[PDB]
């Protein structure tokens, strides 16, 4: 793997808050979207050079936002670009057929109904439903085609700093600043699971030592972007605390579908707190297996994902216990968002110091992709 | 007589038509004419990837076959374009309708190290634990061991070589040579003296120069054509001889005259063998029957399969390091056959069966003479370097649409 | 890793070594093999299991050294001009390199999208007439600016009308110089002082 | 000669308005001072590397100024640093024996009495008198030792954008926005010479065709920094217009001491208007002379100087008619100030785009320095 | 400039040619010389005029080509630490290079500030004892950071406490890898997943 | 006898003491031992300044003097540190109190081009209008002309040279050779045949190889030791011969047997001459009198001055290209004398007059044999390269405090 840190600021040295690749791409060159405090959403063209170093070409600028843009997400088809910011309005952009633009984008839908800054956005698999988290303690589910809100979750007690949508279309997961993870049933439109506390073994005096899983306000990152596995089997939630010794340690919790009230495991991240989780959309054939019960889940394939903390990125897969990659000390301030490319050859990382970076992989470096992507057991 | 002229004309026409059809069948073709014919060819594990460059540099160990000149052990460099550079929208030819143009981008093949060598280099194989150490088989009864870092980049002004180690176990020349991939310093050689010699050079002093044979196996009753260590076991090794026999020997066995297992592999001389890198039970042996026999170590009485598309004797069989179901075999028929194991026993259309058995995947007929030796590239998949008798070396790779599809 | 009297192999700055093994290390494996070496039971069929699973493969050798490849890019690419409107490069496949020692014509480095149904890998010598004439080929022989940070700022300030500056410097040209170029002398004479009386 | 344009902004990409080297240096390494709109005066260490390319080392930052700093000038001894800005107060800095500073500077005197932005400052040869020009239509002469104002010239009718002091201590020259050059007698403290109009040949019918010498408000530069020759013989005034034909041409006027009401000549600069003039303090031996009346002045030595227009720098000497150097298109916006080094090996140019550049000369490239610097025939 | 059958001289990319003339071209000069060649008047004394004026000199050869040397600097030097407090370099003069073919000891590259009154240029063999022992010399043989624009901005934000980041990247290390370094394996094991039941 | 041993001992002691005193007198000393002695040495006008490097690369044209081996015309490269790099606070030796340390910074001297040459290279001089063209004097009656860009970088496998031009005007060997700096292609040569030959190679066809003499001057009655064109006049040129005579010739004069001017320059053989680059009237002639005579072309009857600090015959006199008042002279006394014109006739202290006349500025006694030939560097002031008989080449520069002060 190679690490290319960009020495030129994308948003006039203002913090970059979000990144996302165009998932609809099926070739070798990719489209990337970045949001910043400069009230601009910039779309760039990313491709590898002859040597293998990533090269970024500027494509377009979207300045309709009046305040800082915090989250940018592409639809599963890569056709609609969702941008949310401090103006509490979500803009849906599409390609249409203004001096600085190589290609032009225009707003199609203005999703309104939030009262404060929007921090995270997640699409549904079909692309006709969307979910957004905001500072106003509410997570709103929107009908994309109608461009109107369809449900509001106000059970949160603080800022909602992360929302993910189940690829099987059964649950919606929200992480809030109140150290509480919430899982809402997509059919009941109510709260299905609450995950706030956690016990750690047996106490010294035979007591039930129970603490809070997630971090307090001391986190330096606005976001707690958890994520579902592309197959949907596992749920990865950053910003977790484990009382290993007399002091707590930062970790990312890993939950199963079989039981969502207790995680299978936790990936520890000593040092700073984990804030983002993003999975590679490529299903890989299993590595030559040394037979052990080490795998997080036992399925014929494996999936690579990345966990971004304040100052590092850890690259894990499904079957190994230890991460196969670790990058750190490439940005002078807290990281904001990570995004994989469609082919898995790029991992874009954004940080609040104003500069972004890329992690590139050679052909079949992560693994051998499956011949056919496994079919999903959708709930609907 | 007329035989030589007719053969030359037919071979020239076949090479011309193969060159014309090469764009449809290959993604990389590099034909180079060496100074002298090479009897051996092996890819070195080194690949240097200079940062900021669109290519990688691989290395090859080759020999020279001079009738009356000074013979050389050669280490050469080959430049191969990087995968990321293989997609480039540099120019668009509006006439041919391709992103082509001959331009100035070309593969660079050059000789890096030349070392003196008394006699022809029958076969040169590097030690996996140390690529600096290379063992060569001479037309003499001794096996030579060189360290190319301890020799000048240019050959000596005159005289024969000064080998770092000389191993004297045989009485005649040979061609089979293999290092132990699990025990550093253990070398096996096979010769026409009907014996296989095992040396352990792991305890040689600094000033030592001659090593006697540690063990001699005399099971074979004919010329021992090839010997090869097992890739996962530090004790088992196979050998194929002119007596139509393949023998599996255990170094822990005290009987040096009877192998642990014996198999009547073929009906004529068996010239080569190679173990599959991904399966510890499967191996392949190429024979003079124009056949390649697949053998399972768990069932040696039954031949697993027989690849039967060659037109003459087979001298080298090597597995692909990047795919367990891919095999390769070369011989005197000027052809290099690549076979797929996963297509054995599959139904075939009447016209497809005209070309050959379903297990046959690819045919390389770019050589105008007997293919002396070929080797898979361990770093770049589907890249094979083959050297023939007419001092011709070809580093090639078949088209992606043939194996990927 | 020194074997005998030979020094261990020295890995260069940008060298990579192909893996010595292609399978994970199983501890009991060899032992089991020994059993299967002595039982000689023909109950196992490897070819039968080959078609029931995916072939074991491995990828090209990549760099895995600690802190090996870390680079910085100070350039953003800005493309201006409609150009020729060439078709999509992605749909043209890999660029093939075909070079021959005996060819006077230089090496070929380009794609090949001609389609046939007769030139098979099973038969390299299979002729395909009416599409390829089998004669000797060798008989005889808009803007993409790479802006730096300062240039990127200026481009953002101006737009598509912006162009990178081309510095113009003229070296020390004296009246006493004899071998000095005359073009620079005239360009500097364009600024010649004008006196008044 | 070599040109080294700095790719890193000295004042946070804000415009750089002034530059001046420490004239008191007598070695090979020099001290440079830069003023910007960021309300900071930055002092750097400049020296040539082993290859000959200039290298800039940051030394100190002076943030006492509240608004943009427009002019920075070093005393002839290089011991007192004068900084003037939009706050109408001139700070005199000295080295005394604040986290970013390698060396520390503190304000000694706060010269007050201006009502608007200060644009130019000139020291006297003895270093005990100073002269400053400001937007308030007044040029003020200060007593440096007493730290108080000693004289005010209010004869200007617009902004005063340049002031120079006679090295012989007889005159003070001011250039204002009213297209008028003024020469004040240092002893009478009144106006000695007015130079505004100029005739050009005979008309077509004998009329006395007379136009205005200097540029109008169309000038893109705040400054009209004229300069005296180090010996004092000549006076160079930029931002001049000559009606050669039916159209005007930009030029820099050259006046003599013998008569100050008519220039000897004008150096034409086609294109943009000249704004700054700075002379090299090194007296050079005469080049092998081709005998002609080409020299501006006939003296045993010669002096090299530079004229900076909006987008170019022209390098002249005394005896040649055409400039021996020309540099252009190194900055994306208007140049602000130029300054020679003590040894003549450096010429620092500042521009309003936020970046500065250096012009370096090899050993004895400009000429052969005099063994002894000529003594000045001061008036006083 | 082609002379006979020889091509004109080709100036390389970074080549400089010493000037062919050392004086400005005077048109009538030769003619006057011719007169002075035949007059043979001893009225002119060159040595007398030599002491009445400055000698005619010229400097080292410099580059004067159009757009020859134009460079960009993206680095600002920030020096931190008191160091050893070495004396001022300027007062030590030029660094002399003294190398000899027969000396086993490597070349000397350094200043020389020893002062004598006996070792004169007029007499190279003039000995100066009691200061220099005339025996064979060859008998046997704080921080200055170079910040980029981004690092300079971070330094301005923080101050002297700021230090440049050292990126730490670990390549692809897999459980099946056998030749992978153990240090990276343990560093990655430091992040090993912990399961709960 | 004892003379050789005593001379060798004295010269070795003098070289030792000079090497010990070298830091006080030089800013640069580079002693290099060549493969063979060089009879000629000339600085090429090329100076390559690689960007991002602390040095420049100059080139030198040299010859070889082999008794019975193959002779070569050599073009060599010398690396000299840049002026900006001469001030460097790298290390501070707390013991010696200097910013010194031997370190690893050193001058790189290497041979770039070697061309075959029949016979010794008496003197090689490049054409100023084209540094690619170099004229060489052989021990034969012919003068050779080479273009080093038309010859291989390495010499031929065997055989003599292949000169680009052969000029046949003389009957014996010679040493004086000079191109015309105002007329391209005009070459003057002097030999023991008592004549001076002028060639014009500016009209040679592409396939031409032999050029006859355009003009022959026969004024001298002895061996014409040296000839040199005037630096500003395309018609006048001076010559010094063994008949104690210096002659000024005009090519416009139809009399080829009588010079335009004749001067009884010295009392013995005059071996060299050189014109001042800054004054068209002043020249200098070095004689066997151990003297250098200064001549004014406007008054030839009176000798302007006589420099008299040499101890033996003088063979080369060259002016400094960067200072009109600086002169240099070398000879068989193993010394290179540098003189200041502006110090002629100055009062001198009693002990200073012991060293020599006031006009004497510097003495270079680092050569243990006769200085065959020296040359000023036209690009770096005060840098002189001198080659002696004992295959020793020295590129040096005296201390700054000696001339600048």
UniProtKB/Swiss-Prot annotation, chains A, D:
Extent of the WD repeats: 11-54, 64-97, 113-152, 155-194, 214-265, 285-326, 330-371
A Gene Ontology BP annotation from the UniProt entry: DNA replication-dependent chromatin assembly
Post-translational modification summary for this protein: Differentially phosphorylated during cell cycle. During mitosis the p60 subunit of inactive CAF-1 is hyperphosphorylated and displaced into the cytosol. Progressivly dephosphorylated from G1 to S and G2 phase. Phosphorylated p60 is recruited to chromatin undergoing DNA repair after UV irradiation in G1, S or G2 phases.
Localization annotation: Nucleus; Cytoplasm
Keyword check for Protein transport: no
Chief site of localization: nucleus
Molecular function terms, GO-annotated: chromatin binding; histone binding; unfolded protein binding
GO cellular component terms attached to this protein's record: CAF-1 complex; chromatin; cytoplasm; nucleoplasm; nucleus; protein-containing complex
Keywords for this protein: Acetylation, Cell cycle, Chaperone, Chromatin regulator, Cytoplasm, DNA damage, DNA repair, DNA replication, Nucleus, Phosphoprotein, Repeat, WD repeat
PTM-bearing positions, type Phosphothreonine: 380
Record's subunit section: Subunit of the CAF-1 complex that contains RBBP4, CHAF1B and CHAF1A. CHAF1A binds directly to CHAF1B. Only minor amounts of RBBP4 are complexed with CHAF1A and CHAF1B in G1 phase. In G2 and S phase also monomeric CHAF1B is detected. Interacts with histones H3.1, H3.2 and H3.1t.
Function summary: Acts as a component of the histone chaperone complex chromatin assembly factor 1 (CAF-1), which assembles histone octamers onto DNA during replication and repair. CAF-1 performs the first step of the nucleosome assembly process, bringing newly synthesized histones H3 and H4 to replicating DNA; histones H2A/H2B can bind to this chromatin precursor subsequent to DNA replication to complete the histone octamer.
Entry's family note: Belongs to the WD repeat HIR1 family.
Name this polypeptide is given: Chromatin assembly factor 1 subunit B
From Swiss-Prot, chains B, F:
Organism: Homo sapiens
Family label: Belongs to the WD repeat RBAP46/RBAP48/MSI1 family.
GO CC, alphabetical: ATPase complex; CAF-1 complex; chromatin; chromosome, telomeric region; cytosol; ESC/E(Z) complex; histone deacetylase complex; nucleoplasm
Pfam families assigned to the protein according to its UniProt record, in alphabetical order: CAF1C_H4-bd, WD40
Complex and partners: Binds directly to helix 1 of the histone fold of histone H4, a region that is not accessible when H4 is in chromatin. Subunit of the chromatin assembly factor 1 (CAF-1) complex, which is composed of RBBP4, CHAF1B and CHAF1A. Subunit of the core histone deacetylase (HDAC) complex, which is composed of HDAC1, HDAC2, RBBP4 and RBBP7. The core HDAC complex associates with SIN3A, ARID4B/SAP180, SAP18, SAP30, SAP130, SUDS3/SAP45 and possibly ARID4A/RBP1 and ING1 to form the SIN3 HDAC complex.
Listed GO biological process terms: brain development; chromatin remodeling; DNA repair; DNA replication; DNA replication-dependent chromatin assembly; negative regulation of cell migration; negative regulation of cell population proliferation; negative regulation of DNA-templated transcription
Gene expressing this chain: RBBP4
Region (Interaction with ARMC12): 1-126
Entry keyword annotation includes Repressor: yes
InterPro entries: G-protein_beta_WD-40_rep, Histone-bd_RBBP4-like_N, WD40/YVTN_repeat-like_dom_sf, WD40_repeat_CS, WD40_repeat_dom_sf, WD40_rpt, WD_repeat_RBAP46/RBAP48/MSI1
Renumbered ranges of WD repeats: 26-119, 120-169, 170-217, 219-264, 265-308, 309-365, 366-398
Variant or mutagenesis effect after changing residue 122 to A: Loss of interaction with ZNF827 and loss of localization to telomeres
Localisation per UniProt entry: Nucleus; Chromosome, Telomere
One example GO MF annotation: histone binding
Record's protein name: Histone-binding protein RBBP4
Effect listed in the UniProt record for changing residue 389 to A: Decreased interaction with ZNF827
UniProtKB/Swiss-Prot annotation, chains C, E:
Protein's cellular compartments: Nucleus
Domain of life: Eukaryota
Signal peptide segment: none
Domain notes: Contains one Pro-Xaa-Val-Xaa-Leu (PxVxL) motif, which is required for interaction with chromoshadow domains. This motif requires additional residues -7, -6, +4 and +5 of the central Val which contact the chromoshadow domain.
Quaternary data: Homodimer. Part of the CAF-1 complex that contains RBBP4, CHAF1B and CHAF1A. CHAF1A binds directly to CHAF1B. Only minor amounts of RBBP4 are complexed with CHAF1A and CHAF1B in G1 phase. Interacts with PCNA; the interaction is direct. Interacts (via the PxVxL motif) with CBX5; the interaction is direct. Interacts with MBD1. Interacts with histones H3.1, H3.2 and H3.1t.
Family per record: Belongs to the CHAF1A family.
Function: Acts as a component of the histone chaperone complex chromatin assembly factor 1 (CAF-1), which assembles histone octamers onto DNA during replication and repair. CAF-1 performs the first step of the nucleosome assembly process, bringing newly synthesized histones H3 and H4 to replicating DNA; histones H2A/H2B can bind to this chromatin precursor subsequent to DNA replication to complete the histone octamer. It may play a role in heterochromatin maintenance in proliferating cells by bringing newly synthesized cbx proteins to heterochromatic DNA replication foci.
Protein name, entry field: Chromatin assembly factor 1 subunit A
Biological classification of the source: Eukaryota, Metazoa, Chordata, Craniata, Vertebrata
Gene: CHAF1A
Parent-protein residues present: 463 to 713 of 956
